[PDB]
Ligand binder design. Structure first.
Ligand code: BCL
Ligand code: BCL
Ligand code: BCL
Ligand code: BCL
Ligand SMILES: CC[C@H]1c2cc3[nH]c4c(c3C)C(=O)[C@H](C(=O)OC)c4c3nc(cc4[nH]c(cc(n2)[C@@H]1C)c(C(C)=O)c4C)[C@@H](C)[C@@H]3CCC(=O)OC/C=C(\C)CCC[C@H](C)CCC[C@H](C)CCCC(C)C
Ligand SMILES: CC[C@H]1c2cc3[nH]c4c(c3C)C(=O)[C@H](C(=O)OC)c4c3nc(cc4[nH]c(cc(n2)[C@@H]1C)c(C(C)=O)c4C)[C@@H](C)[C@@H]3CCC(=O)OC/C=C(\C)CCC[C@H](C)CCC[C@H](C)CCCC(C)C
Ligand SMILES: COC1=C(OC)C(=O)C(C/C=C(/C)CC/C=C(/C)CC/C=C(/C)CC/C=C(\C)CC/C=C(\C)CC/C=C(\C)CC/C=C(/C)CC/C=C(/C)CC/C=C(/C)CCC=C(C)C)=C(C)C1=O
Ligand SMILES: COC1=C(OC)C(=O)C(C/C=C(/C)CC/C=C(/C)CC/C=C(/C)CC/C=C(\C)CC/C=C(\C)CC/C=C(\C)CC/C=C(/C)CC/C=C(/C)CC/C=C(/C)CCC=C(C)C)=C(C)C1=O
Ligand SMILES: [Fe+3]
Lengths: 305, 278, 255
């Protein structure tokens, strides 16, 4: 049995659906929606409909403008043209303060100055999306758990990037724009602060990560295996519970000792994923403003190996 | 029964074991071969654990560890107090967990449900060994594995990683990372998404799925569908430990020193940048 | 100094985590719970002074003003049941299993169990239904892949389980759900899709046999399915992998 979970085997088509949309179809409707063959094996097929809303565009004006300022900024340390740009790429970045300074818009537009700008629009871009996952939700009926969800994510980016590196002073801090060094950063960020391994937040954050790992795996599973009675379309089973909802319910109950509802699970979900970056910000908002060395803390209280 | 719907589903089935003798539930729980077998490596588990700490380990079950064997003892069975207890505790670990797995295969026989959940669980165990057995195995001794301690085996990750410079510069590591964060996010999205289709505003009805696909497709440009997130859910976490297990079996066996350098085969390739134009 | 700590060593950071930790424990058992909306309360009896046990963290009703039609179903409902269930005893402990007492798949017990689901066409955002063959659709096309419809059907026996005639696909969502069967001498019979191997010239199953394909929950509505219906037939099948082959719940190998 199975194989109606992964692989699929068959495929049905035809017309294309589309819901209300309190606020216009103007932008909506969009592109043709060219189905995808082998895309319909693993997921649905239909590519599009797609919106083209208000806040939806600035994230592009911005977002784009941004991408660039970087690529344009990893010019000066390039000489130009393909071979070069194709040699490193992963190496290039756009380094923050140097003479250090503080929270001064620094040394001119130069130094670290450009970080300044690109960074500023990522503020605009990312904030314009929230408008969408948020207000875009009032037009189809659905609620903003989404938006909110995405708000913890803005926290981490907020802090580590903007909020965090200021309560201190120096803009020097904060994540550079790259692929290889922006890695480096994280590494010398902990390293300065003893070891981000003794930081209670990052740790619970790692605690939380695996938890969303544990839980998503399991979830997809306890549903792909009950999909016989259509253990999916959970929303319907949320309404009038089917034996599928139970069968699943019952499994972990006689195994761990406790079962939920086809509704709590997703609750434990949102929750898990969120508490994630959440603690990691709390743990950042506090690294450098209240602790320069984390190991101390640990062996300053009682915990350490 | 114990539950409302419980009853109806409690029939002498499963039994991969024999045919009863060990087919009953002790409370909410289900006692079977793998029930006492699990209690097996568990008992002896917490039976033994407490011991190596009883040596003059210390206080707070945070800094009490069980360091694996020594590196001149490379593959043999060492005494005990000197790290042999890792061999003995870890043999029961494997048995302890996998059996837990099989125990599940039973449970999903009378309910006659998916064989899925269990199978998902193994990819999980796989990692375990590659980190403890396999890696250590293709390298030398039950010594390139981690201690068993709360606040200690966190020294194994630093020391070993750093060994190499900036693990970050690892092929797979790097991968398993991307993978981890995605599904990390991703559940929050199907996670935060459902509650929302089933609990909108506060005076507005309970919407249809037609809205789920509409709502998201009407976001990025694509909305994969129910089954989707659930097959997806599978991959991503699944893959995490898959491409993960992959890099840590490449360090020490496959690789010498400096993870970055690896990435230099690409750097200084003949033609420089490979493919300039003319 | 260290314009951080509060006393002779009482850093602001310390409580920060206690704040987080307990308030965390907060969510769990209470909010994050709500996992009692279903299968609660639990099954108790009749005796002496106080009954020997029962819960109380139990929240409040959550009224669900359903999609379409009369929408009112607070999850914290009485529920329970007590509908026909033929499961007798075996031992004396409230663990010792309960065995069939008739025709297992035929009865409505075990790995072949159906709930007591509402009687109505699943849904559809634009009011209509979902579950429907293609003999009703118009524009829907089963592309080149596997077109049963006149393709064989079997189980562990081997053949004539029946032939085909169509599929019940996902009208509102786009995807195949059920498959139409006719036992030649039995017109209707739609197996799941999530358990029958499709291919070319054969459409092997596993759940049942052409010996049980006759006596499966029948659709009283020609071209219409209702929640209740789906689960019965759905449980019917799945339940062959234990009830069907007489000896499928047993052993395999030894140890
Ligand atoms: C591959 C990389 C390393 C590794 C790197 C790390 C790092 C890095 C960390 C851990 C941490 C942990 N490791 Mg380790 N760990 C490895 C392999 C293992 C193995 C194993 C058999 O292979 C085991 C059993 C463990 C077990 C554990 C846990 C005891 C602990 C947190 C687990 C967790 O949050 O998830 C399980 C989570 C759940 C089941 C759901 C959690 C539910 C909510 C979030 C909790 C609510 C309140 C709760 C009681 C508070 C707990 C606080 C504790 C600090 C966790 N590790 C490998 C070898 N491990 C973390 C730790 O101790 O942090 C200080 C940590 O920082
Ligand atoms: C040597 C370095 C340190 C270390 C240093 C750090 C630092 C530093 C940080 C973490 C953080 C994290 N660490 Mg660590 N970490 C170490 C070892 C570990 C181990 C382990 C087993 O050993 C584990 C499991 C973890 C796990 C984790 C995660 C729980 C957490 C991820 C935060 C994040 O990405 O925010 C995700 C945030 C977002 C996704 C914001 C969204 C951004 C916007 C929305 C997207 C716009 C981009 C664009 C649109 C996308 C298109 C493509 C673009 C071109 C990019 N770390 C070592 C010890 N770790 C972070 C954290 O939580 O801080 C406390 C963090 O800051
Ligand atoms: C300075 C140190 C290095 C570093 C060195 C290492 C090393 C070394 C390792 C990792 C590993 C990992 N790192 Mg790293 N890592 C660093 C920074 C990071 C960062 C980051 C933001 O920068 C991230 C996101 C990560 C992320 C990760 C993970 C992808 C990976 C471990 C996850 C996993 O598969 O667990 C899977 C966990 C298991 C499989 C445990 C299984 C145990 C069994 C199955 C469960 C037993 C049942 C239980 C006991 C019973 C419970 C009973 C209850 C009490 C009731 N690392 C820094 C730069 N990293 C590990 C890895 O996979 O290698 C690549 C690893 O070994
Ligand atoms: C939290 C601790 C550290 C840190 C530690 C690490 C570690 C450790 C690693 C990275 C790596 C990455 N980091 Mg980092 N990182 C930090 C902060 C950041 C910040 C930030 C908030 O400023 C950003 C934007 C990033 C961004 C990134 C990515 C560019 C990269 C991995 C890609 C990925 O999986 O992302 C998210 C990707 C997804 C969620 C997948 C889907 C998203 C994409 C955009 C969708 C593609 C669809 C396709 C294009 C079709 C589109 C059609 C229409 C356009 C819709 N990091 C902090 C400072 N980072 C990794 C790397 O190696 O990268 C090279 C890595 O190993
Ligand atoms: C990729 C697959 C993901 C996944 C899936 C998954 N996990 C699973 C399952 C599934 C589908 C189950 O069915 C099973 C379960 O029941 O889940 C509810 C389970 C489970 N996954 C667990 C853990 C777990 N999963 C992890 C990860 C993942 N699990 C992945 C993200 C991790 C990680 C990455 O760190 C951990 C720690 C268990 C909580 C649970 C079943 C394990 C269990 O209960 O084991 C039984 C053993 C005993 C009861 C006693 C054994 C005692 C030992 C002898 C002593 C061991 C000492 C130890 C070395 C100490 C370590 C130091 C610590 C003290 C700090
Ligand atoms: C618990 C919080 C988790 C979370 C949640 C979350 N994220 C969110 C949301 C939610 C609920 C949204 O609503 C929003 C969304 O739409 O998600 C589907 C989002 C989102 N999370 C994203 C990414 C993301 N989330 C991450 C993490 C997380 N998101 C957490 C795990 C991560 C990382 C680093 O781990 C990433 C990379 C975005 C894809 C999406 C929208 C938010 C965002 O990133 O801002 C919008 C960005 C732009 C408008 C930039 C435009 C792109 C430029 C054109 C790039 C230039 C060219 C490009 C480089 C070439 C490639 C082009 C291809 C795209 C074709
Ligand atoms: C979509 O469908 C689904 C449901 O809905 C139909 C579910 O519910 C459901 C179950 C939901 C969950 C919330 C389980 C969560 C999984 C994790 C978060 C990973 C961690 C795993 C664990 C097993 C945690 C381990 C241990 C504990 C949480 C503590 C141990 C506590 C006990 C064993 C309590 C037992 C009590 C006794 C033995 C005392 C007896 C008391 C009596 C009243 C009798 C699932 C999976 C599901 O998929
Ligand atoms: C509750 O049930 C469910 C849903 O229901 C409500 C779902 O949705 C659902 C679907 C969710 C997924 C499939 C999640 C996949 C995981 C991710 C992490 C998503 C990331 C996917 C991406 C494609 C990321 C990229 C995102 C961006 C925002 C970057 C590019 C954006 C642009 C807007 C580019 C600009 C271009 C244009 C406007 C083209 C314009 C053309 C003309 C104007 C002409 C699932 C799974 C589900 O379970
Ligand atoms: Fe779900």
């Amino acid at each position: 049995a199975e194989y109606q979970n992964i692989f699929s085997q068959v495929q049905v088509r035809g017309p294309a659906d589309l819901g209300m949309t309190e606020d216009v179809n103007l932008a909506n409707r969009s592109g043709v929606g060219p189905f995808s063959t082998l895309l319909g094996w693993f997921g649905n097929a239909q590519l599009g409909p797609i919106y083209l809303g208000s806040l939806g565009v600035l994230s592009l004006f911005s977002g784009l403008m941004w991408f660039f300022t970087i690529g344009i900024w990893f010019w000066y340390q390039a000489g130009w043209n393909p071979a070069v740009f194709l040699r490193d790429l992963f190496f290039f970045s756009l380094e923050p303060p140097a003479p250090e300074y503080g929270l001064s818009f620094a040394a001119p537009l130069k130094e670290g100055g450009l970080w300044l700008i690109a960074s500023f629009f990522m503020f605009v871009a990312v904030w314009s999306w929230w408008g969408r996952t948020y207000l875009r939700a009032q037009a189809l009926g659905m609620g903003k758990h989404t938006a909110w969800a995405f708000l913890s994510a803005i926290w981490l980016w907020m802090v580590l990037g903007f909020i965090r590196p200021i309560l201190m002073g120096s803009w020097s801090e904060a994540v550079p724009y790259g692929i290889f060094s922006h890695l480096d950063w994280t590494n010398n960020f902990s390293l300065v602060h003893g070891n981000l391994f003794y930081n209670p937040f990052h740790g619970l954050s790692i605690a939380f990560l695996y938890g969303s790992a544990l839980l998503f795996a399991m979830h997809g599973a306890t549903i792909l295996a009950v999909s016989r009675f259509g253990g999916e379309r959970e929303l319907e089973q949320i309404a009038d519970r089917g034996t599928a909802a139970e069968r699943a319910a019952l499994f972990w109950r006689w195994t761990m000792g406790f079962n939920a509802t086809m509704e709590g699970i997703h609750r434990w979900a949102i929750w898990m994923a969120v508490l994630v970056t959440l603690t990691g910000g709390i743990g950042i908002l506090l690294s450098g403003t209240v602790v320069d060395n984390w190991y101390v803390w640990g062996q300053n209280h009682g915990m350490a190996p | 029964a114990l539950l409302s719907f419980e009853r109806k589903y409690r029939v002498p089935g499963g039994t991969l074991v024999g045919g009863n003798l060990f087919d009953f539930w002790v409370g909410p729980f289900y006692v079977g071969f793998f029930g006492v077998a699990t209690f097996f490596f568990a008992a002896l588990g917490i039976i033994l654990i407490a011991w190596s700490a009883v040596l003059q380990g210390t206080w707070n079950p945070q800094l009490i560890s069980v360091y694996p064997p020594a590196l001149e003892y490379g593959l043999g069975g060492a005494p005990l107090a000197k790290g042999g207890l890792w061999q003995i505790i870890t043999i029961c670990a494997t048995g302890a967990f996998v059996s837990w797995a099989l125990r599940e295969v039973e449970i999903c026989r009378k309910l006659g449900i998916g064989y899925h959940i269990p199978f998902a669980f193994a990819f999980a165990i796989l990692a375990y060994l590659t980190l403890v057995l396999f890696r250590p195995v293709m390298m030398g001794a039950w010594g390139y594995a981690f201690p068993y301690g709360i606040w200690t085996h966190l020294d194994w990750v630093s020391n070993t990683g750093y060994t190499y410079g900036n693990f970050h510069y690892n092929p797979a590591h790097m991968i398993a990372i991307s993978f981890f964060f995605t599904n990390a996010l991703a559940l929050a999205l199907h996670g935060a998404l459902v509650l929302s289709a089933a609990n909108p505003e506060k005076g507005k009805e309970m919407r249809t799925p037609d809205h789920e696909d509409t709502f998201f497709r009407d976001l990025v440009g694509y909305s994969i569908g129910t089954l989707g997130i659930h097959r997806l859910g599978l991959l991503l976490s699944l893959s995490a430990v898959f491409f993960s297990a992959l890099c840590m079996i490449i360090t020490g066996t496959i690789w010498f020193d400096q993870w970055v350098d690896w990435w230099q085969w690409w750097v200084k390739l003949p033609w420089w940048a490979n493919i300039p134009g003319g | 100094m260290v314009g951080v700590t509060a006393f002779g060593n009482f850093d602001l950071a310390s409580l920060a985590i206690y704040s987080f930790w307990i308030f965390l424990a907060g969510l769990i058992y209470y909010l994050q719970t709500e996992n009692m909306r279903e299968g609660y309360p639990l099954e108790n009896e009749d005796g002496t002074p106080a009954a020997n046990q029962g819960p109380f963290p139990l929240p409040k009703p959550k009224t669900f003003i359903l999609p379409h039609g009369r929408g009112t179903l607070t999850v914290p409902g009485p529920e329970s049941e007590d509908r026909p269930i033929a499961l007798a005893r075996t031992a004396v402990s409230e663990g010792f299993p309960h065995a069939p007492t008739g025709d297992p798949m035929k009865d409505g017990v075990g790995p072949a169990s159906w709930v007591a689901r509402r009687d109505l066409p699943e849904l559809d955002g634009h009011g209509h239904n979902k579950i429907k063959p293609m003999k009703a659709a118009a524009g829907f096309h089963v592309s080149a892949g596997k077109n049963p419809i006149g393709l064989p059907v079997r189980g562990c026996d081997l053949e004539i389980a029946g032939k085909v005639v169509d599929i019940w696909v996902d009208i509102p969502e786009q995807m195949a759900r059920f498959l139409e069967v006719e036992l030649k001498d039995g017109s209707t019979r739609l197996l799941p899709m999530q358990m029958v191997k499709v291919q070319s010239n054969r459409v092997h199953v596993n759940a049942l046999s052409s010996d049980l394909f006759a006596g499966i929950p029948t659709i009283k509505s020609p071209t219409e399915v209702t929640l209740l219906e789906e689960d019965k037939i759905c449980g019917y099948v799945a339940g062959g992998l234990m009830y069907a082959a007489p000896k499928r719940k047993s052993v395999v190998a030894a140890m």
